[PDB]
């Protein structure tokens, strides 16, 4: 479908342009597992970067 | 001519079919500024999609 579901393992507060903020337990849709450690994700009506080491595929 | 020249502002690694991979500083010929955020570009003998927010008209 739109991508894979991952669960945020930790809280993350966006620090730079187009990063998502999320909390531990948030389900994030990962649209792309881009190289470079930041994945294109979507949460709560925002698309943006998610640090790949913060999420677990569920 | 063949289109406008743009400079890549950031590295982009192609994630899907027919996207261009490029590096910051690449000069890309934009053949068409298609609606939907991805433009028809050309770089290094490949034609493909370029994310429009990654390039600056030069």
């Amino acid at each position: 479908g739109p991508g894979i579901q991952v669960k945020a393992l930790y809280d993350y507060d966006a620090q730079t342009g187009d990063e998502l903020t999320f909390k531990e337990g948030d389900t994030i849709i990962v649209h792309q597992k881009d190289p470079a450690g930041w994945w294109e994700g979507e949460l709560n009506g925002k698309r943006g970067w998610v640090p790949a080491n913060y999420v677990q595929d569920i | 001519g063949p289109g406008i020249q743009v400079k890549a502002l950031y590295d982009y690694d192609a994630q899907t079919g027919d996207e261009l991979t490029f590096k910051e500083g690449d000069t890309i010929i934009v053949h068409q500024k298609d609606p939907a955020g991805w433009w028809e570009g050309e770089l290094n003998g490949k034609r493909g999609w370029v994310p429009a927010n990654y390039v600056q008209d030069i």
């Binding site: 739109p2 393992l9 930790y10 809280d11 993350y12 620090q15 730079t16 342009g17 187009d18 649209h31 792309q32 470079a36 450690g37 930041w38 294109e40 698309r47 943006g48 970067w49 640090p51 790949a52 080491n53 913060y54 | 502002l9 950031y10 590295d11 982009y12 994630q15 899907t16 939907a36 955020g37 991805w38 999609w49 994310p51 429009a52 927010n53 990654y54």
Partner: peptide, 18 residues
């Protein structure tokens, strides 16, 4: 109790392809 984020590319998210 969390890992450090990976180094950033300083770039915007690509527009939706979908």
């Amino acid at each position: 109790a969390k890992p450090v984020p990976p180094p950033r590319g300083a770039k915007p998210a690509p527009p939706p392809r979908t």
